[PDB]
Every structure is written in C-alpha cells, then in structure tokens.
Amino acid sequence: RTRSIGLVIPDLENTSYTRIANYLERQARQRGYQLLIACSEDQPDNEMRCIEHLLQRQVDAIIVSTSLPPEHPFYQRWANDPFPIVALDRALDREHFTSVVGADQDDAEMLAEELRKFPAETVLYLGALPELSVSFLREQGFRTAWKDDPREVHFLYANSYEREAAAQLFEKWLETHPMPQALFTTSFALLQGVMDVTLRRDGKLPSDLAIATFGDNELLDFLQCPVLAVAQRHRDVAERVLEIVLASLDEPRKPKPGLTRIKRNLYRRGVLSR
Amino acid sequence: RTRSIGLVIPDLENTSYTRIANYLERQARQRGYQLLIACSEDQPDNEMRCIEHLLQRQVDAIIVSTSLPPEHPFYQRWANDPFPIVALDRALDREHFTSVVGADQDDAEMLAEELRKFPAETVLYLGALPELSVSFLREQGFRTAWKDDPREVHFLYANSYEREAAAQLFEKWLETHPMPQALFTTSFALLQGVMDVTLRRDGKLPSDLAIATFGDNELLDFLQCPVLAVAQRHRDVAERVLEIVLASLDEPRKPKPGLTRIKRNLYRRGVLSR
C-alpha cells in the first residue's frame, strides 16, 4: 500500500482535464494520498505503457480517461481483479468498471431550451463528427428541446472539432444562407471558428446574436451579445472519482459497476452578465 | 533510487504553472522519470510539509516554486547536501541552489520599446505592489526603454495584482485624467480590470488603444485595437529545469549555483493578429 493513486489522462493542457486534476490533488493530499499523473497524449500504445508503469510503481489504484475502445481486451485483464480501475469522462466496460462520465444529453437539452427562449428566426446548429457518442448525445438533447418549436434549424457538421475546420464550413455555408440569429455550437473551438469568420466578415464580433455553447470561458463576458455556456462541475467530478476509488480500497466489497453522470452548470455571459 | 522527482507548486489552476507542469511531466516520463506533484497553495507551512512528504516517499530530487524568501533557514538544511533541490520561477538561495527564473527586466524593456513604436500621446503604466522585486524589475525595464523618449508617462499602482483592485483604481484615476492612448500593464488581471471599466464606461472594448501586457491569452486575438503580450517559454523552461535536475543527478559535480533567466516570447494580437 504505497498510499498512492495513478491518474492517466491525455495531457495537462486541456483546462477541463487540469481543473479536475487540480481538485483531485487537493483532495487526495488531504486524505494523505499521492497522485501520480501519467499522460497518454491520447495515444493507445502510450496509455497502456503508462498503465504498466503505474503498476510497476505499486500504485494502489488507477483513474483512467481511456483512449482505447473500452471493449478492447487490455482492460479485461482486471475485469475480475479487486484492483480498482475507475474511469473518467470516457467510460470503461459498463459491467466490470465504475465510470464517472458527464450527462451530455441532459446538458444539451438544458442549454437548448434556454437558447430557444430567444427571438431568432434563423437558428443554426454547428457540430462535428456526428458518429461519435458525444456528438450524438448532444444532438439528441438539442432535438428533444426543439421538437414542437415551429422554426426550422439548419444543421452543419464539421469533419473535426477544430477551429479552422469550423471557419471553412461556416464561411462556405454563409454563401447559400444568411447570418443566423441563434447559434448552437457543441465545443468552444467550433464557436471560435465561427467568430473568426464573423470578425473577418464584419470587422467586429456580434452584438445581435444569441449564442449557446459547450465549454466555458470567462472572457465571454466581454461579448456585446447574449451568451449561454455550459461547463463541468470540476470539483464535484473530482469528489466522486476519488470517493469511488477509496470505497473500493477501504470498504469490504466494491461499488456497483456502471455509469454515473454529473450535469454541467449553465453560465449566462456576454450582455447577460450585465 | 525511486527514479522519481517531486514538484512543489502553488496550484494547478495558474495557467502558467500548469503549462510548465504539462511540458514537465511529458519530458520526465520520456526520460523514464515519474513526477509527483505536491501543491502548497502558496502557504509557507503547506510548502514545508509537502517537502517532508516528497522526501519520505524517497523522491530523487525536488523542483520547487518556493513561497519563502530567498535565504530562509528551512532550505539551508540542504545548502551543502548533494540532494538536488532546483528552484523554479521564485529563486532559492542564489549561492547554494540553481534557479530557473524569468528575465523580468529584459522582458519589460522589450515589451516597452515595442509599445513606444505606437503613436500615442498619453501613455499609462498600471502595476501593483511597487516594493516587490518582480514589480521593481518590471518598472526598471520599462524606464530603460522610455528614458530618452520625450513623452510623459503617468504611473498608477494597485495594491494587489487583482482585477478589481485595477478597475477601482483606473476608474478613480479617470475622474482626474482623460483616456490614455497607450497602456502598459504588468499582469493580465490588471489588463482585465481596465477592460471592465472601458466596457462599463464605453459599452464596448476599445479599437483605438495600444495595449502591452504580461501574461498571454489567445482570445486577445479578437480585440479591435493593437495588442502586444509577453509570455513564458513553458517548454523551454520545463526543459532546462529538468536538464539541471538530471545534470545534478548524473554528473560528478553539481551545475553552477545561481540564476539562469529565460526570456519571454512576444506575441502580437488584436488587430496585429490579422
């Protein structure tokens, strides 16, 4: 018992990953537990050797944000091992592992519902990679909240969650369609790409546009238009990840396998901050 | 030999701290070294218990960003010990320890003569806590580059490096003086403070004002005025810190004690970005 827990995440650049890591250090410290942060750079072969190293260092448990398809036999080596692997953000096998993931569909609905309360006649939903679970859940949540609404919603789907991708698509789309009055993006990078176009196009960011977005950034408070943004409950998420880790280590018997979801917070920024 | 290195920093919220941490983990793991992050929350008592903890865990070396004043007797317990304690950002005893620190004076000057290149009649230098070494170095650097300049620079000094200290001060100052045409802030938070009033005052952020700042954020690209900002070379700093750690670990002799300064990068944002 080294009184330590490994934490495998893509990087410590993503402020979402870092924030959860921050609240996790602070909490683990407190219970007299050391965090060993091993970064996979989101690569499967990287992730597995990171796992190995934590195992050699006699870590007492690993918290993973996996890069491999959970199915993928790497982790089924511990499917019936009392050694705890607790998953974050990207779920591990629903039947042998507990996983703390976000509530994307509920999140998307909530954000969507709020945005609809805005007078806008042309509303545009910008997203990426419709095939992925996250992309899908968000679109579902959004459709849930707009069904009986009489307006039509244009859907636009970039081939990646990158800002440069989004600018190209939106600029092209502007050729056939006029500027929207309600916007819904499913990642901050996608919202940036749009603004690059709106700024290059108008010389100035909008005041006359309702924006709803995933991710949050306090600098959105300087916008001159209404803005809605959702972000994780980083401390709340850190609490349960760790609470599960110690429940398996200390209690006789492990917590139930399966998923547990934490909702995001809605933040009203831009002109809604005044 | 645990083949591990402790890292004591205030927190994992400070973007500059986290980025250096990111480039440090990834470089340590590659060299086959595990990082253990302990956070001091910037409290001296917290810092010292951390260092105890890292040492009990047979860490091979500590990288510290200390909250103690440079020659404090806590650290002289290792003044002549071959155990490597390497300092980051905030220097340890300049004669028995290596410290990898910024070139605040050089950086401030460089930023300053860049700013002076802009046609602006009323230039204001906003800062905080003039008596601290870092604050002093910045003012020194700035005066160096504006010394022969025939133009007047009113100086303004908040009692803290915080955003609403800045907003109150600048707003109060506006009553007695009209709007500047060049601005120089010594921290991003101070720059935010300004924009809060500039937005509350004008209802829209400026297009007509040359901005120079310490700290950086890519979102500054959307501003409609010229912007210059200076930030650490995170990877560069992480690289040398760790090179010193290993040069200390492997070589029969220690590296020279003392400081080594790494210059910040200049980034041109706002209207300078397009």
Beta-carbon separation of A39 and B25 below 8 A: yes
| Contact (Cβ atoms closer than 8 angstroms) between residue A198 and residue A206 | yes
Nearest to A267 by CA among A206, A208, A223: A223
Same domain, yes or no, for B124 and B190? Answer: yes
Same domain, yes or no, for B164 and B188? Answer: yes
Give the gap in angstroms from C-alpha A81 to the nearest C-alpha of chain B: 25
Radius of gyration of chain A (CA): 21
Same domain, yes or no, for A134 and A45? Answer: no
Q: In what order do the strands lie in the sheet containing A85-88?
A: A258-262, A98-102, A85-88, A62-64, A4-9, A34-39, B34-39, B4-9, B62-64, B85-88, B98-102, B258-262
CA A68/CA A122 separation, integer angstroms: 40
Same domain, yes or no, for A182 and A236? Answer: yes
Residue at a domain's end among A77, A95, A113: A95
Tokens of B5: 């290195």
CA A64/CA A241 separation, integer angstroms: 10
Q: Is B113 on the interface with A (CB under 8 A)?
A: no
Element (H, E) at B126: strand B123-128
For A103, A116, A129, A263, B207, the CA distances from A145, given in Å and listed in that order, are: 15, 8, 21, 16, 39
CA angle in degrees (0–180, nearest 5) for B233-A8-A62: 145
CA angle in degrees (0–180, nearest 5) for B1-B6-B12: 155
Beta bridge partners of B39: B9
CA angle in degrees (0–180, nearest 5) for A53-B251-B71: 95
Element (H, E) at B174: helix B163-176
Nearest to A206 by CA among A230, A227, A177, A228: A227
CA A42/CA A19 separation, integer angstroms: 18
Beta-carbon separation of B57 and A34 below 8 A: yes
Tokens of A168: 């190209």
Nearest to B265 by CA among B240, B233, B241: B233
CA A35/CA A144 separation, integer angstroms: 40
Q: Is A271 on the interface with B (CB under 8 A)?
A: no
Counting beta carbons within 10 angstroms of the beta carbon of residue A167, is it exposed (0 to 12), middle (13 to 18) or buried (19 or more)? buried
CA B7/CA B34 separation, integer angstroms: 10
| Contact (Cβ atoms closer than 8 angstroms) between residue A63 and residue A51 | no
CA A248/CA A271 separation, integer angstroms: 46
Counting beta carbons within 10 angstroms of the beta carbon of residue B171, is it exposed (0 to 12), middle (13 to 18) or buried (19 or more)? middle
CA B268/CA B274 separation, integer angstroms: 10
Report the residue count for chain A: 274
Nearest to A13 by CA among B48, B270, B141, B16: B16
Nearest to B166 by CA among B190, B182, B187: B190
CA B115/CA B186 separation, integer angstroms: 13
Q: Taking CB atoms and an 8 Å cutoff, what residues of chain A touch B3? A: none
Same domain, yes or no, for B68 and B111? Answer: no
**CA dihedral over A187, A189, A192, A193, signed as positive or negative:** negative
Same domain, yes or no, for A58 and A188? Answer: no
| Other beta carbons less than 10 A from residue B123's beta carbon | 22
Beta bridge partners of A14: none
CA A66/CA A86 separation, integer angstroms: 10
CA A210/CA A187 separation, integer angstroms: 16
Same domain, yes or no, for A80 and A169? Answer: no
CA B202/CA B224 separation, integer angstroms: 14
CA B160/CA A158 separation, integer angstroms: 44
CA B170/CA B155 separation, integer angstroms: 11
> What is the number of structural domains in chain A?
2
Query: Beta strand pairing status for A85-88 and A226-231?
Result: unpaired
Same domain, yes or no, for A121 and A59? Answer: no
Element (H, E) at B164: helix B163-176
Query: Beta strand pairing status for B98-102 and B153-158?
Result: unpaired
Radius of gyration of chain B (CA): 21
Q: Is A203 on the interface with B (CB under 8 A)?
A: yes
Domain around B159: 96-274
| Contact (Cβ atoms closer than 8 angstroms) between residue A217 and residue A233 | no
Give the gap in angstroms from C-alpha A166 to the nearest C-alpha of chain B: 16
Say how far residue A149 (Cα) sits from the centre of its chain. Answer: 27
| Other beta carbons less than 10 A from residue B176's beta carbon | 7
| Contact (Cβ atoms closer than 8 angstroms) between residue B128 and residue B159 | yes
Nearest to B235 by CA among B262, B269, B267: B262
**A21 to chain B: closest CA residue:** B12
Experimental method: X-ray
Nearest to B161 by CA among B132, B139, B129, B134: B129
Q: B228: helix, coil or strand? A: strand
Residue B108 φ/ψ, nearest 5 degrees: -65, -50
Phi-psi region of A270 (alpha: psi -120 to 50; beta: other; left: phi over 0): left
Q: In what order do the strands lie in the sheet containing B123-128?
A: B153-158, B123-128, B182-185, B210-214, B226-231, B265-270
Nearest to B29 by CA among A106, A9, A3, A208: A9
Dihedral, CA of residue B39, residue B42, residue B43 and residue B44, to nearest 10:
90
Same domain, yes or no, for A101 and A230? Answer: yes
Which three-class secondary structure string do you get for chain A?
CCCEEEEEECCCCCHHHHHHHHHHHHHHHHCCCEEEEEECCCCHHHHHHHHHHHHHCCCCCEEECCCCCCCCCCHHHHCCCCCCEEEECCCCCCCCCEEEEECHHHHHHHHHHHHHCCCCCCEEEEEECCCCHHHHHHHHHHHHHHCCCCCCEEEEEECCCCHHHHHHHHHHHHHHCCCCCEEEECCHHHHHHHHHHHHHHHCCCCCCCEEEEECCCHHHHHCCCEEEEEECCHHHHHHHHHHHHHHHHHCCCCCCCEEEEECCEEEEEEHHHC
Q: Taking CB atoms and an 8 Å cutoff, what residues of chain A touch B199? A: 222
CA A147/CA A140 separation, integer angstroms: 11
Residue B30 φ/ψ, nearest 5 degrees: -65, -40
Residue at a domain's end among B60, B95, B130: B95
CA A250/CA A239 separation, integer angstroms: 16
Same domain, yes or no, for B183 and B213? Answer: yes
Beta-carbon separation of B26 and A38 below 8 A: no
CA A190/CA A160 separation, integer angstroms: 9
CA B47/CA B42 separation, integer angstroms: 7
Say how far residue B98 (Cα) sits from the centre of its chain. Answer: 18
Element (H, E) at B154: strand B153-158
Tokens of A272: 């809604």
Which three-class secondary structure string do you get for A86-125?
EEECCCCCCCCCEEEEECHHHHHHHHHHHHHCCCCCCEEE
Contacts of A136 (CB under 8 A, 6+ apart): A130
CA B187/CA B264 separation, integer angstroms: 14
| Contact (Cβ atoms closer than 8 angstroms) between residue B226 and residue B111 | no
CA B196/CA A213 separation, integer angstroms: 23
Q: Taking CB atoms and an 8 Å cutoff, what residues of chain A touch B224? A: 203-204
Q: B114: helix, coil or strand? A: helix
Resolution expressed in Å: 2.7
Same domain, yes or no, for A253 and A169? Answer: yes
Nearest to B237 by CA among B11, B10, B16: B16
Q: What letter would DSSP give residue B222?
A: G
Same domain, yes or no, for B201 and B125? Answer: yes
